[PDB]
Automatic annotation (TrEMBL), chains A, B:
Entry-linked Pfam families: Methyltransf_25 (PF13649)
Tagged with keyword Signal: no
Residues binding S-adenosyl-L-methionine: 18, 23, 66, 92-93
MF terms in GO: methyltransferase activity
Residue ranges annotated for the Methyltransferase domain, each copy included: 41-135
Record key words, sorted: S-adenosyl-L-methionine
The UniProt record lists the keyword Ribonucleoprotein: no
InterPro entries xref list: Methyltransf_25, SAM-dependent_MTases_sf
Domain of life: Archaea
Protein name in UniProt: Methyltransferase domain-containing protein
Length: 212, 212
């Protein structure tokens, strides 16, 4: 994803839009089904902080991290207007500065399109490291490899599996890293054992992982 | 720059890395602001061809040239996987084999650290020659002379302005030719008149030149 893509759509940047709320209310019940015990949570690639505020209201100590200065800037204003104590930090999910075993939870939502294989490998490694052995890694992603076929329902869809990426034209174009449930889980198997898994929609998944 | 430096960092060798994409998306809008009319483009010192594919998708006839056999080899594989018609050739920017007035555009991005004064002089001369009088020379460079002071934020930085070079240690060391906006433009004034100039970041510049 990129600058224009996010400026144009509210789904990941406008916490009060119907698009964003829809995402929250869909995941909310699933997140509570596996986050009964409160603790320290890390919102990796938090965007504008929507899921952070949600967890903070459920009695969680939240820390939000994102690589975009713009995402973080908006996050803070939202935290200000909502009088939130969630701390937002501009950081790289591929290399976090937190100490080892710092979190009880680490949530990673709708963000894999931003990582190629070797980068997602680094993120998983970092997640396992900053997670307490008793902690939980919870991620939600879309099998865009399976969705690719009938994705157009957007003017064009130019794939390239010889690279695992795809260009979608809406004008402007965006190139996404394409992931399939089998590819995500393979890399996950190097660092975690799966606690649970929920199928969302036609091709989305909420997975609960425990660090090794 | 050199072999290890490029093998270690993805910025100029991994077209799908976040580092490389960041560079593309930052320059993309600026390149279109001065490349409204499509035509024949020469990507001088193209590296792995990232900016070539970008222009090719915008409807440009692209030719990529680089002195490294390795850069060119990877470029071709990327072109294959992306099913691109961009032709990559292993050549020397200091002495191109193209006929005079062959291109409408010649882009030169993040590559001056590789040229000492007399070499960059030869490149500019060659660029003017292969460029159509109505063509445009577009280069992006970093004033590493101004950046030198606060570059460390890398273990060491050993300059040597009595030579216009600097050694940066990350292990391994790399020696870069150091250029300042004033030095680059001086040599440019011998062959071109400037059409436009955009300041990028704290000390980087995108310059548009017209041949004399
Ligand atoms: C779909 S968006 C927002 C996702 C957010 N978790 C949500 O559900 O609202 C994906 C975010 O990933 C972030 N991102 C991309 N690469 C990153 C990296 N290396 N480290 C941290 N965040 C990154 C972007 O800045 C972008 O805000
Ligand atoms: C930072 S790198 C890649 C730059 C590329 N334009 C990009 O932005 O992705 C600089 C490139 O300059 C090339 N180079 C160095 N000397 C050269 C010469 N005399 N002729 C052509 N390319 C040269 C290298 O092989 C190296 O790939």
């Amino acid at each position: 994803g990129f600058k224009e893509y996010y400026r144009v759509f509210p789904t990941y940047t406008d916490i009060n839009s119907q698009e964003y709320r829809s995402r929250i209310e869909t995941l909310e019940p699933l997140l509570m089904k596996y986050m009964k015990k409160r603790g320290k949570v890390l919102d990796l690639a938090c965007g504008v902080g929507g899921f952070s505020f949600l967890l903070e209201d459920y009695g969680f100590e939240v820390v939000g991290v994102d690589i975009s200065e713009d995402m973080i800037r908006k996050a803070r204003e939202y935290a200000k207007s909502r009088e939130s104590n969630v701390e937002f930090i501009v950081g790289d999910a591929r290399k976090l500065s937190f100490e080892d075993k710092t979190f009880d939870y680490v949530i990673f939502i709708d963000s894999i399109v931003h990582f190629e294989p070797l980068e997602l490998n680094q993120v998983f490694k970092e997640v396992r490291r900053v997670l307490k052995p008793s902690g939980k890694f919870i991620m939600y992603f879309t099998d865009l490899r399976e969705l690719l076929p009938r994705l157009k329902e957007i003017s064009k869809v130019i794939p390239d599996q010889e690279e695992r990426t795809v260009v979608i034209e809406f004008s402007f174009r965006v190139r996404f890293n394409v992931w399939g449930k089998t590819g995500v889980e393979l890399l996950a198997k190097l660092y975690f054992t799966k606690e649970a898994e929920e199928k969302v929609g036609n091709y989305s998944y909420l997975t609960v992982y425990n660090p090794k």
